[PDB]
Design a protein around this ligand. Structure first.
Ligand SMILES: OC[C@H]1O[C@H](O[C@H]2[C@H](O)[C@@H](O)[C@@H](O)O[C@@H]2CO)[C@H](O)[C@@H](O)[C@@H]1O
Lengths: 514, 128
């Protein structure tokens, strides 16, 4: 869809959508172009889904890190600002939205996490992470706690993971090196270990999310939080006397927060690209437009040069910029998506005791630098014998059962999962179709118990793909070509051998007998 | 077995909170004195870490594993040495706490106490 003559805009629920909506009604007042600002849930996930099929907003707002992958998938329109426009914003904020040398979004404002603290509860914030257990013990005796922050989003734990040496993708020369990932190095392990100790010793609760941590701080229950400039408005409205300061050090090194550039891309499918350009360039990216958003929820340090006067006259912006410089600005490469999903899983699982730090981080390193079991359905995964040997990678996903589709691959962890053997070779003589019904019943029974099956073969290319297609075709009554494109979209190297294709083709005829 | 799990969780929370009478009641009703959470932390771990002397002593009378290692390598004596709990460390030792047990950083209770300025505790531990 996406209607001509209107603008729809998506922005995250923590940003100043009301103040953006006010810029939008200025636009409407002047142009008669209705502007609808929306803040959908899981916006960063939801946008590629809708935009893939030509739907979605006209303009999408997110930090720059997701935008390279949006562009790579053909979801974004190149932006072509005049040189006189490009000069109104800091050169480096343009760099953050530049992907293969094309400008793919408008930068708006620079974001970094800071340590926020209640000045009444804690006149002097700690300089180190190592101090925080002792403060929490003092504070707990008065019925408060030292620190609460969102443990469900890895962005909030990253400054500590990276302080001693963690990193996403190493920056070599002038390219990012997508095989050089620093998620399971000695630094990352040290940082995550410290966070896990905080929890196991009951200084934090692993269930804390954004809203719990904001409520606790803004009601005076907790002495410190970790959050960005958008959060300051709700503290103001509260009765809390707060400061924004340098994040504490860890092992004597500063916390290294990922620095995000809030950005606005134009949907490639929008028929209103010029309207979006006019709204963004001459209504939002002006001192008056940025001020309407900023009054609702602070943007941080806005990309707009003309604001270095007004900004930096705020100590909380100064604090943001100090944490920003101690950090690294996020890469925008298409792999950021898999990286974040991998670190999110590691953090939640280590924080919950479902995985040790070493198992959690190792699993995330492989998934980020190289890949892992591919989700087909929520209870059904597809992969290789290499994966079947990485217990950390099965556990990370919550695997409860495996279908080993091979004649020579051992069942490595028979203690810990339910195993179904299909002992066929990947050649023109194997009758894998003899096992389709057996395997579907196994999958179904494991699913009906809420578990997850990992189907693998030697390569994850032919034998296990063939089993996974047979499940889709019978379970949802779809043809082979439909099932094949669904899986191929998720695991691009699948290639059943010609005899397996025919056996699936014959199985198609039996399952859709009209 | 489901009821025993409930008792255990309350026991961990009571040992953590320093609720002496609650811990006794749960002991009387049959709580696993070595109940664990998903980090392998015991009620003895929590009582030692949080300075609940009376609770420490009840758990040990009831047969708590004095050298229990949580999923992370910490023993109750490591946790008590962290804060210089002379009284708690004394009974843990009385009950056979292992002065040579190492934590995830390779440090013993003596190392932990020196690293935190608990030097009174360190003179005690040094002779063992
Ligand atoms: O949690 C990983 C998540 O972190 C970042 O998202 C930030 C965002 O940049 C901030 O503007 C604010 O909205 O908080 C978010 C944390 O939930 C990355 O930008 C995002 O892609 C990543 O998934």
């Amino acid at each position: 869809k996406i209607e001509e003559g209107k603008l729809v805009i998506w922005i995250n629920g923590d940003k100043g959508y009301n103040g953006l909506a006010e810029v939008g009604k200025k636009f409407e007042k002047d142009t008669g172009i209705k502007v609808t600002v929306e803040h959908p849930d899981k916006l960063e996930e939801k946008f590629p889904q809708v935009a893939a099929t030509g739907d979605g907003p006209d303009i999408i707002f997110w930090a720059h890190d997701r935008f390279g992958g949006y562009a790579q998938s053909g979801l974004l329109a190149e932006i072509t600002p005049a040189a006189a426009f490009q000069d109104k914003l800091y050169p480096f904020t343009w760099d953050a939205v530049r992907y293969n040398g094309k400008l793919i979004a408008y930068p708006i404002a620079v974001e970094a996490l800071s340590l926020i603290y209640n000045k009444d509860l804690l006149p002097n914030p700690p300089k180190t992470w190592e101090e925080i257990p002792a403060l929490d013990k003092e504070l707990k005796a008065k019925g408060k706690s030292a620190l609460m922050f969102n443990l469900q989003e890895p962005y909030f734990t990253w400054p500590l993971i990276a302080a001693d040496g963690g990193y996403a993708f190493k920056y070599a020369a002038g390219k990012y090196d997508i095989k050089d990932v620093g998620v399971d190095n000695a630094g990352a392990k040290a940082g995550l270990t410290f966070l896990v100790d905080l929890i196991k010793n009951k200084h934090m609760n692993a269930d804390t999310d954004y809203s719990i941590a904001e409520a606790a701080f803004n009601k005076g229950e907790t002495a410190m939080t970790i959050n960005g400039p958008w959060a300051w408005s709700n503290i103001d409205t509260s009765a809390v006397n707060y400061g924004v300061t340098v994040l504490p050090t860890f092992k004597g090194q500063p916390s290294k927060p990922f620095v995000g550039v809030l950005s606005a891309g134009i949907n490639a499918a929008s028929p209103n690209k010029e309207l979006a350009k006019e709204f963004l360039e001459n209504y939002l990216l002006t001192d008056e437009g940025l001020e309407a958003v900023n009054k609702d929820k602070p943007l941080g340090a806005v990309a707009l040069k003309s604001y270095e006067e007004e900004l930096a006259k705020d100590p909380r912006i100064a604090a943001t910029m100090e944490n920003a410089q101690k950090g690294e600005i996020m890469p925008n490469i298409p792999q950021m998506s898999a990286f974040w999903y991998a670190v999110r899983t590691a953090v939640i699982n280590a924080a919950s005791g479902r995985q040790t730090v070493d198992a959690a981080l190792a699993a995330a390193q492989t998934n980020a630098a190289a890949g892992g079991p591919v989700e087909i359905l929520p209870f059904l995964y597809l992969g290789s014998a290499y994966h079947a040997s990485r217990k950390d990678m099965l556990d990370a996903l919550g695997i409860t059962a495996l279908i080993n589709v091979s004649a020579n691959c051992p069942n490595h962890f028979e203690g810990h999962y339910q195993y179904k053997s299909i002992p066929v070779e990947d050649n023109h003589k194997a009758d894998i179709s003899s096992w389709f019904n057996e395997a579907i019943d196994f999958i179904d029974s494991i699913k009906n118990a809420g578990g997850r099956v990992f189907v693998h073969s030697q390569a994850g290319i032919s034998r296990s793909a063939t089993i996974c297609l047979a499940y889709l075709m019978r379970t949802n009554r779809v043809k082979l070509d439909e099932a094949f494109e669904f899986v191929k979209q998720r695991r691009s190297i699948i290639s059943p051998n010609f005899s397996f294709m025919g056996q699936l083709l014959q199985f198609e005829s039996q399952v859709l007998a009209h | 077995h489901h009821h025993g799990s409930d008792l255990g969780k309350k026991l961990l929370e009571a040992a953590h909170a320093g609720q002496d009478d609650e811990v006794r009641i749960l002991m009387a009703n049959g709580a696993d004195v070595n109940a664990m959470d998903n980090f392998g932390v015991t009620p003895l771990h929590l009582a030692a870490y949080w300075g609940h002397f009376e609770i420490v002593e009840v758990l040990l009378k009831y047969g708590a594993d004095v050298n229990a290692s949580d999923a992370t390598g910490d023993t109750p004596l490591h946790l008590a040495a962290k804060w210089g709990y002379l009284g708690i460390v004394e009974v843990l030792l009385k009950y056979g706490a292992d002065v040579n047990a190492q934590d995830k950083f390779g440090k013993t209770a003596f190392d932990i106490s020196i690293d935190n300025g608990n030097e009174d505790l360190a003179e005690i531990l040094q002779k063992l």
